[PDB]
Design a protein around this ligand. Structure first.
Ligand SMILES: [Mg+2]
Ligand SMILES: [Mg+2]
Ligand SMILES: [Mg+2]
Ligand SMILES: [Mg+2]
Ligand SMILES: [Mg+2]
Ligand SMILES: [Mg+2]
Ligand SMILES: [Mg+2]
Ligand SMILES: [Mg+2]
Ligand SMILES: [Mg+2]
Ligand SMILES: [Mg+2]
Lengths: 80, 78, 83, 136
RNA sequence: AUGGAGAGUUUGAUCCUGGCUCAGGAUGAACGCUGGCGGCGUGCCUAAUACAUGCAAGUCGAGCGAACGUUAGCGGCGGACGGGUGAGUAACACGUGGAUAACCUACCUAUAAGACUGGGAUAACUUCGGGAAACCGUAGCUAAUACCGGAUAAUAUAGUGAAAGACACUUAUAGAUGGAUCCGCGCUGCAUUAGCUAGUUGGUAAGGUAACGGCUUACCAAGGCAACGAUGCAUAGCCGACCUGAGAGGGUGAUCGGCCACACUGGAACUGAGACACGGUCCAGACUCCUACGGGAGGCAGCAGUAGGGAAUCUUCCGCAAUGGGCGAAAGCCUGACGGAGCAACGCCGCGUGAGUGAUGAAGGUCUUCGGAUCGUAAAACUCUGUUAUUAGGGAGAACAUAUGUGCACAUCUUGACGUACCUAAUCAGAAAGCCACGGCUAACUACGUGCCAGCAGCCGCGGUAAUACGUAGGUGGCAAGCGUUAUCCGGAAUUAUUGGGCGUAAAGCGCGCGUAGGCGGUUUUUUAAGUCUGAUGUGAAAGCCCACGGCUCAACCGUGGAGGGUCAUUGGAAACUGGAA
């Protein structure tokens, strides 16, 4: 039994751990069969790990501990 | 119409209970007061409150982790 | 709290029964934990005993109860004193 | 059209203009609101009778009424019959279906309906426009 | 492969786009005018409007306060589960799939164990007093598996429990059991709704909750959301399912199950493991009656009924025999949960109001030019039959223990509301009738009054004097205990076209540039593995549809094992094309 493992870029960051995580994904439309792409804006927290314009890093869901952030990982690979 | 017995059982029940719970909140009131008062109750008062949350804990009138938050809020202040 | 189902299935004017792990407060056709067989209560059946009780062996071996005077079908089985 | 402008503004079915538009709705007594019912028949009381003549390919002259239904949606309904009824302030039971060539009627009156049981001098119609005394 | 049809109508005629209307199935259906059967399923969908009236959860004293195996009141549980309706809710409420290094739980039954010492008090009881009663207090008691003090014991960083059979209660580890929160994806219409949000979005604390958290306050700050449709209004309880469809799709949500939300309307707590509680308390408000008017009462969205509004949906019914549901050791017990009869033709089917004969066969209807066909082998009047009617034995679901012999298990004695059913056996002719049409779509033709009148109408249309389209008559056609009509959905409709349409003149190309957001992309070599392809699992409950099987005199209807339960979940795996990078 494990956490989530989603990866993806960021938009920016502000003070106090506002590690928002943009995630892009594909889906079909339900009838016409076109491969439509769409995103989702997520949130997680850390110390000073990321910055604006490109901080693609995996996150992992945990107990909530916020009002919107429900991921506890900032494990970093690619950046600017 | 079985409730018309139950109208005055619970009245006697909490009518007894709120005094014991008020003495529970009063019995713990002087304890963390007393550790920051530099008083003579560095002993013999925290164990009184441990008797209060213990004797309250034996009844169902307070939940278990609540009493863990009194004990975890008092002996951990030592 | 866990019990054994004896519900009123089948065509009307012909009260049948299905045997399943039930609960004491959920109703007859209510939420079913797991199946425990059936029995032809039709009183016009020669071969009827339908309890493959290896999938019902966990019930009385983990805290069941007898059901509501179905005890003579509990008589034709024998699952007790094995422990 | 191509697919990208077809997953963007999708298909959108045709509207359904419905027959008997002056029906299906019950305006409430307490709450004083229109509703939706999809009801087969409704009551109503009558105001006029009259008869306008012209039906340009049909050319005879026939009568009509102005019933208004439960909670006052006034209407023009056509009376089937060689004879008629003799009642102002009726208790009709109206019926859908447009008698054509009269501009402004889409509704019938069922003969009988606890106000007038139709015409007495008709034998082999026997359910239309209110007859009786058959033992066929 | 067990899988799809069309017709009429624009003109003097023909093609072609385009509407319009039929032929099929449906139903929690009604209304007309005529009605006899049996086996089932189902009946305020408009007012979640108001309740005159009776009834829907009560049980128990071997623990202890009355008479001769009958009563209290303690208290022990139980009223948080059954049952009921859709008002609100476009939301993690539901449907699917996961997460608890965020968490809870007595009732049942594994263990590992205890009941030590007391003491004090109080209901009932009686007495007084006041109030048409209602509400109450005083006075003196006395209990009780009802309270409570100290004794020594895990689970906090050192800590508390026990009142019962004879010769039951409680303290921990557990299981199952029900919960609770969060997360990914899936959730109708309006752009003639484009700027929302201010504890609003983060941090540190302080608390508080079973549990983390902007859940609440103290500061610190700036955020967070959005053309991948935020906010706003309007409407709608969701789902496995049901109806339609060859399939793709489209339309529904009452039956019968899963899950919410709600109980005159609003709030907030109480006891309780568990409610912010349908048959509970407290507050404010609007209904509603009793009324010494002094204060005092209840909640039909539990069964039947009235008033209302309705197109319309009923017994002010009987019984626990069974099933489960509580309590009590155990009988017993309260149950409009449930089981049966009402009551309606409300669907679905299963039969039969007659039978072998019987010469044109008829008296009498119609056609008639009448010579003869027609109703019509119809009819008699012979010959034939019990289905309906007087009596009968009329006795399917119908079981399981508070015992004794053996060592909670076996055999052996204990329980029927509807009592019509199955039955057999004499044997009647008691109405299988009435609806609608008849010119073409689409099987069904002649006469009489009527003459653009009165009148039919799904559509084109029929009648201005001889209408097969009006109203009758006769005959014929389709029906079947009904027929037909109005109303809602799907197909026909490829008339919303992903399968499966078009834009010159028929409806349809922006007046034409430059352009961001988004959509699509030449040629080759490498690596990747998101889309792609594949297979090992966990899962999509059951009732229902699809075929097989047993049973109901076959049928309607029931039980058995399988498709088969979709986009998913985690790793194995292949790398031609689309991404992704050199
Ligand atoms: Mg023209
Ligand atoms: Mg009401
Ligand atoms: Mg209803
Ligand atoms: Mg009325
Ligand atoms: Mg016809
Ligand atoms: Mg006619
Ligand atoms: Mg076209
Ligand atoms: Mg250009
Ligand atoms: Mg570009
Ligand atoms: Mg397997």
């Amino acid at each position: 039994n494990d956490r989530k493992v989603y990866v993806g870029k960021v938009v920016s960051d502000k003070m106090d751990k506002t590690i928002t995580v943009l995630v892009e994904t594909y889906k079909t439309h339900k009838l016409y069969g076109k491969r439509v792409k769409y995103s989702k804006k997520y949130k997680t927290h850390d110390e000073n790990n990321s910055a604006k314009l490109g901080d693609i890093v995996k996150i992992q869901e945990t107990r909530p501990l916020s009002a919107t952030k429900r991921f506890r990982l900032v494990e970093i690979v690619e950046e600017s | 119409k079985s409730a018309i017995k139950r109208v005055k059982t619970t009245e006697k029940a909490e009518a007894r209970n709120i005094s014991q719970k008020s003495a529970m909140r009063t019995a713990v009131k002087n304890a963390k007061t007393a550790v920051s008062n530099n008083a003579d109750n560095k002993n013999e008062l925290v164990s009184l409150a441990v008797k209060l949350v213990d004797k309250a804990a034996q009844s169902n009138l307070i939940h278990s982790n609540k009493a863990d938050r009194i004990k975890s809020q008092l002996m951990t202040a030592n | 709290a866990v019990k054994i189902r004896l519900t009123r299935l089948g065509s009307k004017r012909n009260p049948f029964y299905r045997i399943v792990v039930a609960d004491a407060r959920s109703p007859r056709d209510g939420r079913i934990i797991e199946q425990i067989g059936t029995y032809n209560p039709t009183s016009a059946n020669a071969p009827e005993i339908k309890v493959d009780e290896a999938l019902a062996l966990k019930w009385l071996n983990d805290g069941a109860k007898p059901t509501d005077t179905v005890h003579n079908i509990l008589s034709k089985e024998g699952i007790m004193k094995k422990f | 059209p191509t697919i990208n402008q077809l997953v963007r503004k999708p298909r959108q079915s045709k509207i359904k203009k419905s027959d008997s538009p002056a029906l299906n709705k019950g305006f409430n007594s307490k709450k004083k609101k229109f509703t939706d019912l999809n009801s087969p028949q409704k009551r109503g009381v009558c105001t006029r009778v009259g008869t306008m003549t012209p039906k340009k390919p049909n050319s005879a002259l026939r009568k009509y009424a102005r019933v208004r239904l439960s909670n006052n949606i006034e209407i023009n309904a056509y009376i089937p019959g060689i004879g008629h009824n003799l009642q102002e302030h009726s208790v009709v039971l109206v019926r859908g279906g447009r008698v054509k060539d009269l501009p402004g009627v889409r509704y019938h009156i069922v003969r009988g309906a606890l106000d007038t049981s139709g015409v007495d001098g008709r034998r082999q119609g026997r359910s239309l426009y209110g007859t009786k005394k058959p033992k066929n």
